[PDB]
């Protein structure tokens, strides 16, 4: 884990298991054997379902498609299409989500990049609205993109991280929000799940987020949302801004620090063991020296915008409250 060790940053970014590649090198028909194809078929489920779990009984759904992949019927382009159209892929990814989340998942499953700009969303949402679900899925597969990057005999892979796809810097960072390394499934992480559309404000406005590598503490941030002011009325409380304008720049460049796990038991004010306000157990902070029942940190995950000369102090304060640092980005 990290960057410097092993001279490879991208292994340690959580993309360790996504480098392996699968192509059917066998031409004609497979008779008798069924090792190599069951491997490729498994990688197709691992790619298109994105590591979602398929039960033995479920494997009976899509069994026809599966018995046509093994034959000369479907190239893996078209088998991947057949896995994509079936009732499974509809239940998990299409039916649970709003239309936009569904789109972003379809890029994670089929193309392995994120959408970078709103217009990609314009294209796919437009096709869905004019013609329906099957033409939506065709509109992913029936494009110069899939054909060029995969060539019809190779199982899809995550390429959104890669430099070769032009994408956007935004789509690189967005790439790591959508893929959280081996264990996390489609609904395994928060930010996807079932009813969530994952990144919407981010993916629509091409707000490049930040990357928290998976693990090493602070693996989860799930940073709080912001509203938009008097027009489209908002609550101003919850998050620090991504911007930091003038008047406070003085005193060093501004850094956005995201602290991840904040909890009462963890928050001690620097000295170990939990502080007891009354002689016997009243552990919340006394507001006006009268007992309150309000937690010290009120949402887990608060952010800090801190200029350079104030970093050290803030860096101490986080570790006083036992909060753990997700990432720090210069702004």
């Amino acid at each position: 884990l990290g960057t410097v060790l092993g001279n490879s940053s991208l292994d340690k970014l959580g993309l360790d298991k996504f480098v392996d590649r699968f192509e059917v090198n066998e031409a004609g028909r497979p008779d008798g054997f069924s090792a190599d194809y069951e491997v490729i078929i498994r990688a197709c489920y691992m790619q298109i379902f994105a590591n979602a779990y398929i039960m033995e009984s479920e494997r009976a759904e899509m069994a026809k498609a599966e018995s046509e992949f093994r034959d000369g019927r479907f190239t893996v382009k078209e088998f991947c299409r057949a896995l994509a159209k079936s009732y499974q892929y509809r239940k998990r990814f299409f039916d649970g989500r709003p239309l936009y989340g569904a789109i972003e998942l379809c890029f994670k499953h089929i193309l392995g990049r994120t959408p970078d700009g709103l217009e990609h969303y314009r294209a796919k949402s437009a096709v869905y609205d004019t013609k329906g679900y099957e033409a939506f899925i065709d509109a992913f597969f029936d494009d110069g993109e899939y054909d060029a990057f995969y060539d019809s005999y190779c199982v899809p892979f995550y390429r959104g991280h890669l430099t070769t796809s032009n994408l956007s810097m935004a789509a690189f960072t967005h790439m790591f929000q959508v893929v959280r390394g081996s264990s996390t499934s489609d609904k395994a992480n928060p930010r996807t799940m079932t009813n969530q559309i994952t990144l919407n404000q981010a993916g629509i406005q091409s707000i490049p987020l930040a990357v928290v590598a998976p693990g090493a503490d602070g693996a989860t941030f799930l940073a709080p949302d912001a509203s938009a002011g008097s027009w489209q009325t908002g609550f101003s409380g919850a998050t620090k801004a991504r911007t930091s304008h003038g008047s406070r720049q003085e005193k060093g460049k501004m850094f956005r620090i995201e602290v991840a796990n904040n909890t009462q038991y963890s928050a001690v004010g620097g000295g170990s063991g939990i502080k007891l306000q009354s002689r016997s157990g009243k552990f919340y902070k006394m507001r006006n020296m009268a007992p309150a029942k309000v937690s010290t940190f009120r949402r887990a995950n608060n952010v800090y915008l801190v200029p350079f000369d104030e970093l050290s102090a803030t860096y101490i304060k986080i570790h006083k409250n036992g909060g753990s640092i997700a990432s720090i980005t210069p702004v």
Binding site: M55, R180, T184, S185, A188, P214
Partner: protein, 177 residues
């Protein structure tokens, strides 16, 4: 994904020197202790579903609110995935027993699993209980002290190997909590 060999090389690469005598000496002791590691992995692999069955069944019987309606072991599908999860954890622990370094287990499965079990609503104490049962069961098979299987092997001491396997299971159990 790094073995004992790769780990030493990476450390001697940050040092920017050649491997050297002290490091090669310890690595010679690794290779001379190689067949013990081989037979060890053979023991855990040839008791796999046995360990996973007893471990997760013990996890349910210790804490019977999991199978009560509303728990995360309440359906066949949830129980199947929970059973499957236990099998996969035991699988990458077996890989960490082969490689001698936990780089495969850290980079592959340990990374992101706490936050996934958070995102699913999986109770973490119950998972650490399951990992602990796989730890005691797995060390009991690795030392041939199982109460249902006593196979014949060449005599020797593998206390060090057992402490190593207990280190990997304590790494997973500490990693989910």
């Amino acid at each position: 994904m790094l073995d004992a060999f790769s780990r030493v090389v990476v450390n001697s690469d940050s040092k920017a020197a050649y491997v050297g005598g002290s490091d090669l000496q310890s690595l010679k002791t690794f290779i001379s202790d190689g067949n013990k590691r081989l037979d060890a992995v053979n023991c855990i692999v040839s008791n796999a579903s046995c360990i996973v069955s007893d471990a997760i069944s013990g996890m349910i019987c210790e804490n019977p609110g999991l199978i009560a309606p509303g728990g995360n072991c309440y359906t066949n599908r949830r129980m199947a995935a929970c059973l499957r999860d236990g099998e996969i954890i035991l699988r990458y622990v077996s890989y960490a027993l082969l490689a001698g370094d936990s780089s495969v287990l850290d980079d592959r499965c340990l990374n992101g699993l706490k936050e996934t079990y958070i995102a699913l609503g999986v109770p973490t104490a119950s998972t650490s209980r399951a990992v602990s049962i796989m730890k005691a069961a797995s060390t009991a098979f690795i030392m041939n002290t199982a109460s249902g299987r006593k196979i014949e092997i060449a005599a020797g001491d593998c206390q060090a190997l057992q402490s190593e396997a207990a280190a990997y299971f304590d790494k997973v159990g500490s990693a989910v909590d």
